[PDB]
């Protein structure tokens, strides 16, 4: 399609346009009633570096973020001011790429910022989604 090409869960897709300031990726889904965890990753398809790993942990109500670069995970980022997911419930997560950071919102509420660690934004071209959700729609504009 116009925005990505899968390459339903686990889900992997090549973004038609790579990331950069102004780019938005939207994941719409329903958390499983018995969910423990799910993951949304933005990857550099070539190097397989993970620029942004997003992991809502339903079992402990934590929202963990990290990057996998030079074949190692970095320092986990965990601070939240609320946990925006709940089992059984529909959600919309917006990943917005800004100049210095990603901005992530859930259900229309700003949730976190993640300072870019992988700096070559135009090399981020792959989206992977897996875990304890029913994936309903992915948008990328």
In short:
The chain is mainly beta and 141 residues long.
Binned, the helix content reads under 10%
- What spatial form do the alpha-carbon principal axes imply? globular
Strand order of the largest sheet: 1-2-11-4-5-6-7
CATH-defined fold name: Jelly Rolls
**Strand fraction:** over 45%
CATH architecture: Sandwich
Whole-number total of structural domains? 1
Question: What value does the Rg take, in angstroms?
Answer: 14 Å
How does the helix and strand content classify structurally?
A: mainly beta
Number of strands: 12
CA distance, first residue to last residue? 12 Å
Number of helices: 0
What top-tier CATH class fits best?
A: Mainly Beta
Biggest sheet: strands, sense, closure? 7 strands, antiparallel
Secondary-structure element string? EEEEEEEEEEEE
What does this structure look like?
The protein has 141 residues and is an all-beta fold. The protein has one domain (4-140): Jelly Rolls. It has strands spanning 4-6, 11-15, 24-31, 38-43, 50-57, 62-69, 72-73, 90-97, 101-106, 109-115, 126-131, 133-140. The strands form two sheets. Strands 1-2-11-4-5-6-7 form a seven-stranded antiparallel sheet, with no helix packed on it. Strands 10-9-8-3-12 form a five-stranded antiparallel sheet, with no helix packed on it. A hairpin with a 3-residue loop joins strand 8 (90-97) and strand 9.
Explain the layout of strands and helices.
Elements: E1 4-6, E2 11-15, E3 24-31, E4 38-43, E5 50-57, E6 62-69, E7 72-73, E8 90-97, E9 101-106, E10 109-115, E11 126-131, E12 133-140
């Amino acid at each position: 399609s116009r925005e990505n090409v899968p390459k339903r869960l686990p889900f992997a897709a090549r973004l038609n346009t790579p990331m950069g300031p102004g780019r938005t990726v939207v994941v719409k889904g329903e958390v499983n009633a018995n969910a423990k965890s799910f993951n949304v990753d933005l990857l550099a398809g070539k190097s397989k570096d993970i620029a942004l790993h997003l992991n809502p942990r339903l079992n402990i109500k934590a929202f963990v973020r990290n990057s996998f670069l030079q074949e190692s995970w970095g320092e986990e980022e965990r601070n939240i001011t609320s946990f925006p997911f709940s089992p059984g419930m529909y959600f919309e997560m917006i990943i917005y790429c800004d100049v210095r950071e990603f901005k992530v919102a859930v259900n229309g509420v700003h949730s976190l910022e993640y300072k870019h660690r992988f700096k070559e934004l135009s090399s981020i071209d792959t989206l992977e989604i897996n875990g304890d959700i029913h994936l309903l729609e992915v948008r990328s504009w």
